[PDB]
Amino acid sequence: EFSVSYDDRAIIINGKRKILISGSIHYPRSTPQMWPDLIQKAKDGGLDVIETYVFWNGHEPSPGKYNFEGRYDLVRFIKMVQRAGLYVNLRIGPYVCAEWNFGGFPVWLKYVPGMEFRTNNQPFKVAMQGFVQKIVNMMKSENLFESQGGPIIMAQIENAYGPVEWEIGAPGKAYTKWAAQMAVGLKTGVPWIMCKQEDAPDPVIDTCNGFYCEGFRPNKPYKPKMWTEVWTGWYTKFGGPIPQRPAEDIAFSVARFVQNNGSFFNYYMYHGGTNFGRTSSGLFIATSYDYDAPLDEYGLLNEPKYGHLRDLHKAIKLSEPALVSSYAAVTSLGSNQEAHVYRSKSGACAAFLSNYDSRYSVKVTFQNRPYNLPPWSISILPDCKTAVYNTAQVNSQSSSIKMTPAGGGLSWQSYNEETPTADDSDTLTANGLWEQKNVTRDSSDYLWYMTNVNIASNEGFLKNGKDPYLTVMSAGHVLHVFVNGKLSGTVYGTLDNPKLTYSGNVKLRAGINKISLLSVSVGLPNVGVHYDTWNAGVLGPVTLSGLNEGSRNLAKQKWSYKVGLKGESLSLHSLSGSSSVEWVRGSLMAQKQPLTWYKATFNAPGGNDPLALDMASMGKGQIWINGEGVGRHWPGYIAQGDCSKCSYAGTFNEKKCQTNCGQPSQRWYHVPRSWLKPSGNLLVVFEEWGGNPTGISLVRRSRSA
Ligand SMILES: *[C@@H]1O[C@H](CO)[C@@H](O[C@@H]2O[C@H](CO)[C@@H](O)[C@H](O)[C@H]2NC(C)=O)[C@H](O)[C@H]1NC(C)=O
Ligand SMILES: OC[C@H]1O[C@@H](OC[C@H]2O[C@@H](O)[C@H](O)[C@@H](O)[C@H]2O)[C@H](O)[C@@H](O)[C@H]1O
Ligand SMILES: *[C@@H]1O[C@H](CO)[C@@H](O)[C@H](O)[C@H]1NC(C)=O
Numbered sequence: 001e002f003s004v005s006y007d008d009r010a011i012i013i014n015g016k017r018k019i020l021i022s023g024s025i026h027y028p029r030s031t032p033q034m035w036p037d038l039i040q041k042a043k044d045g046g047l048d049v050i051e052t053y054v055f056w057n058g059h060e061p062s063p064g065k066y067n068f069e070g071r072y073d074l075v076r077f078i079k080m081v082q083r084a085g086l087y088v089n090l091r092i093g094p095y096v097c098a099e100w101n102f103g104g105f106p107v108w109l110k111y112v113p114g115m116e117f118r119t120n121n122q123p124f125k126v127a128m129q130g131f132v133q134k135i136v137n138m139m140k141s142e143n144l145f146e147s148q149g150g151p152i153i154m155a156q157i158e159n160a161y162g163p164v165e166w167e168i169g170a171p172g173k174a175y176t177k178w179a180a181q182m183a184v185g186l187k188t189g190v191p192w193i194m195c196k197q198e199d200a201p202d203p204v205i206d207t208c209n210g211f212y213c214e215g216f217r218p219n220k221p222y223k224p225k226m227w228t229e230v231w232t233g234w235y236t237k238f239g240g241p242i243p244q245r246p247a248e249d250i251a252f253s254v255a256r257f258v259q260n261n262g263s264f265f266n267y268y269m270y271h272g273g274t275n276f277g278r279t280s281s282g283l284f285i286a287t288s289y290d291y292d293a294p295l296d297e298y299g300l301l302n303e304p305k306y307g308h309l310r311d312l313h314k315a316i317k318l319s320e321p322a323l324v325s326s327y328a329a330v331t332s333l334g335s336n337q338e339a340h341v342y343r344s345k346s347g348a349c350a351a352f353l354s355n356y357d358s359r360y361s362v363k364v365t366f367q368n369r370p371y372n373l374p375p376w377s378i379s380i381l382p383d384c385k386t387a388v389y390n391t392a393q394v395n396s397q398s399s400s401i402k403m404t405p406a407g408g409g410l411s412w413q414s415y416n417e418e419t420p421t422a423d424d425s426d427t428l429t430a431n432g433l434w435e436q437k438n439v440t441r442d443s444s445d446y447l448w449y450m451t452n453v454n455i456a457s458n459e460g461f462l463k464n465g466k467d468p469y470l471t472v473m474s475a476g477h478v479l480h481v482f483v484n485g486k487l488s489g490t491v492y493g494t495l496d497n498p499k500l501t502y503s504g505n506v507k508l509r510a511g512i513n514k515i516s517l518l519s520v521s522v523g524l525p526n527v528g529v530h531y532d533t534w535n536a537g538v539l540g541p542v543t544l545s546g547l548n549e550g551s552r553n554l555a556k557q558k559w560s561y562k563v564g565l566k567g568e569s570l571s572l573h574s575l576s577g578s579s580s581v582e583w584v585r586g587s588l589m590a591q592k593q594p595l596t597w598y599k600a601t602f603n604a605p606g607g608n609d610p611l612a613l614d615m616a617s618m619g620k621g622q623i624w625i626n627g628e629g630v631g632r633h634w635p636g637y638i639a640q641g642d643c644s645k646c647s648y649a650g651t652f653n654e655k656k657c658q659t660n661c662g663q664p665s666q667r668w669y670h671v672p673r674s675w676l677k678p679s680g681n682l683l684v685v686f687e688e689w690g691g692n693p694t695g696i697s698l699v700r701r702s703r704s705a
Contacts, residue, residue, distance in 0.1 A: 002146055003015070003147060004146045004147060006191055007222065009224060011153065011154070011264060013087075017263075019263055019264075019320050019324060020263065020264045021047050021265065023045070023270025024268045024271075025052060025270055026053060026269070027071060027077040029071075029273030029289060030071065031675070032076060034674070039080055039081055039086065041295055041301065041306075045270070045310050046316075046317070049266065050088055053096040054135055055104050056105065056106060057104055057105055057106040058279070061279075075138060078150075079144070082150060087151050087152070088153065089153065089154050090154075091159065092136070092155055092157065093156070094132060095117070096159050097159050098282075100282050101524050103282070103525075105117065105532065109127055110437070115127075118164060119168060119171050128179075139188075145189050145190050147189025148189065155190070156195060157179050157193075158179050160196040163196060165199070176199060180192070180204045183204070184204065193207050194206055195207045195228045200219055202220065205224065205226060209227070209229035210229070212257075213230075213262075214253070214262070216257075225262050228264075228266050231268055234654040236286040238284050238286050238637045238665045238666070239637045239638075240286070240640070240641060241639045241658035242639070243658050244292040244658070245656075247305035247308040247309065249649075251309060252376055252377060252378060255312065255378035259352035259354065260340065263323075267294065269289070269293040271293055272293040272297055274289060275287050275289050275631055278444075278629060279442070281632070282523040283498065283522065283523045283524060284494065287630075287633065292305070300610065302399070303397060303705070310396075314389075315388050318380075318383075318388060319342070319350035322343070325346060329342075333354075333365075335357075336356045337355045337362050339352070339354075339364075339366055351366065353371050353373060353378065354373070355374070355376065355377055358649040361375060371387060374392040379391075398705060399703040400703065403614065403699040410696070411585075411600055412598050413598070413599050414583060414584045414590035414597065415572060415598075416590060416596055417594075418566060420448055422452060422560040430558070430561075431556075433537075433539045433542070435536065435537055439537070440521075444564030445632075447519045447564075448516055448517065449519055449559055450514070450515070450516045450561070453512075453514075457511075461546055467505040467546070468506060468508055468544050468547055469504070469506075470502070472491075472500075472540075472542050473500070473538070474517075476499055476500055477498045477520060478493070478518075478519075479520070481502045481506075481517055482518065483507070483515060484508070488504060490689070519537045521536045522634070540555040541555055567597050572597050572599070572686075574627040583599060589693070590687075592690040594688065595688065600696075603678065603680075609701055610673065611698060611699065612670050613668065614695075615667060615668070615669055616667045618685065618696065619635070619688060619691045620636045624683070625671055630670070637664070642658065644656075671698075
């Protein structure tokens with residue numbers, strides 16, 4: 001009764017070939033209350049398919065122990081897409097990349113004996129197989145594959161493994177063949193895909209990802225041409241600018257794919273949303289995952305992009321009957337101009353008129369009619385006669401963002417975190433430096449590295465006014481050097497160069513001195529060959545120079561360790577644990593002091609406009625609302641980059657249209673309205689660096705013209 005197949009031309013759904021317009025919405029990057037609205041906006045946006053990864057590390061935070069509640073109710077999500085009458089592309093992975101913590105892998109999986117990620121490895125294959133089968137059976141049980149009458153029209157195994165293969169060699173090739181075969185073996189009833197996988201074995205369709213995919217061809221003539229990730233922008237990193245991609249360029253890129261036998265394209269992202277909590281964003285990925293998506297982080301329409309693409313879709317639909325019953329024939333129109341014509345025997349005809357010149361308009365003559373093609377544009381003629389649309393002629397009104405403060409400054413109470421000093425009587429120690437992930441298992445961003453340094457009272461520097469020199473090399477990502485109780489410096493890295501060295505004169509005194517290093521990870525790496533093996537934390541070298549002896553290798557002494565903060569162990573973020581301790585009030589409020597907790601109670605504003613926290617007054621830390629993790633803040637990290645003004649025309653790259661340079665990387669932090677009660681809301685902020693909580697203001701988001 002229902003089926004999904006495919007031929008050289010398209011995916012065939014229930015016996016009908018389709019030109020499928022898709023967009024990505026990641027279920028855990030918004031709330032269940034937001035989903036129907038997001039999905040409805042997608043539908044009105046002209047999307048046929050919603051595409052999502054599955055996030056293993058969210059769904060299995062402990063072997064055998066699963067989570068499918070709240071924003072992680074995968075089944076609830078898929079069912080809401082079905083209710084909107086849209087299809088689903090379930091990209092199961094379970095390596096997913098996605099700028100997501102560890103690429104989606106549960107951290108515990110690293111520490112399974114014999115384990116090795118994304119290669120021909122028995123522990124890996126068992127774990128991977130097990131979870132993929134769990135997800136497929138969960139879907140099948142509720143008849144959620146299209147074959148069974150459900151919305152899922154295809155699924156992805158792995159993610160962009162192709163590049164990784166080339167470096168890993170034969171074991172990669174064997175893993176690829178295994179992953180494809182095992183996926184197909186789960187008998188979903190619908191096609192399987194792998195992205196960036198030139199060697200995908202039948203019957204798996206290999207797809208394309210990027211800014212443009214118009215030249216791409218699947219690895220067999222009898223597979224449709226599909227573009228699984230049309231990048232709508234780029235991620236925002238802490239330390240980085242807000243990257244935009246011009247709607248006119250996207251529409252061009254899409255038109256250019258479709259005109260050339262493309263039959264499936266998917267905006268990555270259609271709704272980017274938010275990296276909530278502390279196990280969502282990957283290495284240095286900002287809380288905001290806006291991606292300059294057609295639906296902004298807050299779920300509002302990103303005009304004009306949203307509309308311009310709605311118009312594109314409308315035009316593709318007018319062309320569809322012709323598109324699906326012919327093949328693209330190319331007629332040269334000029335030096336740098338083409339016609340792509342889909343003429344069926346039924347008489348139905350659709351034409352695409354292109355101008356690849358990035359500088360000049362060209363007048364072109366097609367079937368006796370003149371067409372002005374703006375630079376870097378395509379005109380779509382659904383009947384081969386009248387241009388209903390052109391990729392550079394944007395007929396939606398633009399929109400910009402306003403954040404209107406609402407409520408005011410709340411009453412704050414503080415709670416100072418202690419700066420721990422090692423001693424003779426510690427619990428968890430070793431004669432060397434341990435890698436952070438290994439020690440913390442990612443239970444917290446924080447690991448204290450602690451040691452004693454003995455200074456003999458005859459030391460040269462003691463006789464004079466001098467201070468010895470301390471070098472702390474760390475694999476990243478932030479490091480606070482504490483000497484004899486006091487903060488001595490803070491060094492921090494970038495996505496590209498997460499490595500750190502602190503280098504400074506430290507005032508030591510005769511006898512036993514206390515060094516305490518606060519090592520902080522900001523998400524776990526999520527992309528790269530052997531990215532799981534990359535280190536975090538202070539693995540040194542660590543030297544103390546300017547002594548009677550030459551330098552002293554402090555990696556070679558006894559170290560002690562404290563995982564996490566005490567506020568974490570006390571859950572000062574939840575309502576129960578917060579009022580199980582006692583906080584400072586009034587005048588004696590923690591002002592610009594590191595490692596501080598702050599707490600306040602507020603009423604939800606009225607209105608139906610999305611809400612954020614203005615955290616400009618703050619440094620770096622985490623935010624909770626009624627015990628639910630809003631995410632990490634890091635307004636302290638100023639955006640660095642090249643932010644020239646750009647035009648839509650010409651080959652786009654992620655750095656072309658960057659904005660907000662010399663401003664806080666992310667100032668506003670999304671708060672889902674579904675997280676609020678009318679009154680008595682608990683706002684907890686751990687401040688890592690130092691900030692003034694008073695000026696923390698709640699804000700209301702609208703989009704003007
Ligand atoms: C769109 O698809 C068809 C095939 O699916 C392409 O036409 C084929 O071109 C190949 C290689 O150049 C020929 O050997 C085949 O004989 C053609 N097949 C058929 C069935 O006609 C066509 O070129 C593609 N369109 C564009 C724009 O390239
Ligand atoms: O899949 C979602 C994310 O993909 C990321 O890039 C993946 C791709 O990166 C290429 O540079 C590389 O050649 C290839 O091996 C893949 O790893 C995107 O950069 C990211 O924005 C998401 O789209
Ligand atoms: C990892 O942790 C264990 C102690 O729990 C230790 O034996 C091992 O050497 C550590 N290795 C590192 C930090 O790489």
